[PDB]
Amino acid sequence: SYYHHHHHHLSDFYDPRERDPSVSRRPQNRQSDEWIRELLLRGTIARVATLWQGEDGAAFPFITPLAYAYRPEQGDLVYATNVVGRLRANAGQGHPATLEVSEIGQFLPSNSPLELSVQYRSVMVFGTARVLAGEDARAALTTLSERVFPGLKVGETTRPISEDDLKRTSVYSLSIDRWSGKENWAEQAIQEEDWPALGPEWLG
């Protein structure tokens, strides 16, 4: 019978592999805090998401790519942006903020469609951002500027940061609560042995 026939017609996990005993055993691609710190110190572009009140009166996120600097001692990150919405969806002089920094490598081809991927390292940072004023703002802008242009010195390379400058710039400190680090940086995607192998134009 068809029913029976069809019913009848309808593991590398447990088999030998090599493993480097130094490699992180953390699940879901998770990384250490030290790894996260290191990634943050070497990045220069971040995306910040903050929440703004919309037409329907519901909160919705913006995402703004911007220059940033991580200040480990202070326990914050600083950035400047004049981007805003109408009213923040927030009760306070500060507002919750998520900051993302990543290193995006190569797309990784496969003859298996769900193993298709991209190399990445990515950190989400959760905290509260506040706007800075006066010397607080000047120093944070200085640190920012000198971080993202190595060798530049404010007051030598550039004219000093003036009171007009400060008046015209919104500079923020994002005080860190929590963070979360992820890495998926294989040399090659997992392939399917039982489908024809990717040709030379792929992995060559």
Next chain:
Amino acid sequence: SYYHHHHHHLSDFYDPRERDPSVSRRPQNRQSDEWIRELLLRGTIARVATLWQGEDGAAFPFITPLAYAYRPEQGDLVYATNVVGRLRANAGQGHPATLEVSEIGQFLPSNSPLELSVQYRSVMVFGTARVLAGEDARAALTTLSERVFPGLKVGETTRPISEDDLKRTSVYSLSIDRWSGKENWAEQAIQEEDWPALGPEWLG
């Protein structure tokens, strides 16, 4: 008197310039819809921000970098990610989503500290994302995959997308409501004529 003395001690805007009559007159670096479409068609990485319920019971955004494809006819963008939080801060079978795509160029040095900058093109997309099922999910994954790996064909280059595959993947359609395009892509930052000029190690 000091008071008086200090009181006494305490424009290129309106003067001649050249202008290309073809250049956009839109304020705040804003771009056309056609420009936006074009940027979206050529990008392959996006950041998506969606809202999740936190410990204090307040909504907070995630930001996830991911592969995407824009489908102009359908009026959506598609992506796959298994990233989640606990509960979405959302009433529905779909959830509000902001999607960002950018092209980040070079940092642009200046001898004026507030003219320091980076070349950028950036689009924010606002809409509602929904999870796809069955052939809907297979087709969207296919389009995604073949977009981000030009020349790849699902079912030839790769084995077909199976029912197990679909079971294990969350594939979304972000139906577009509104979008917003920005460009700041100068060849050189504005400099201060009255401070020493940046040396050769900067602009050379």
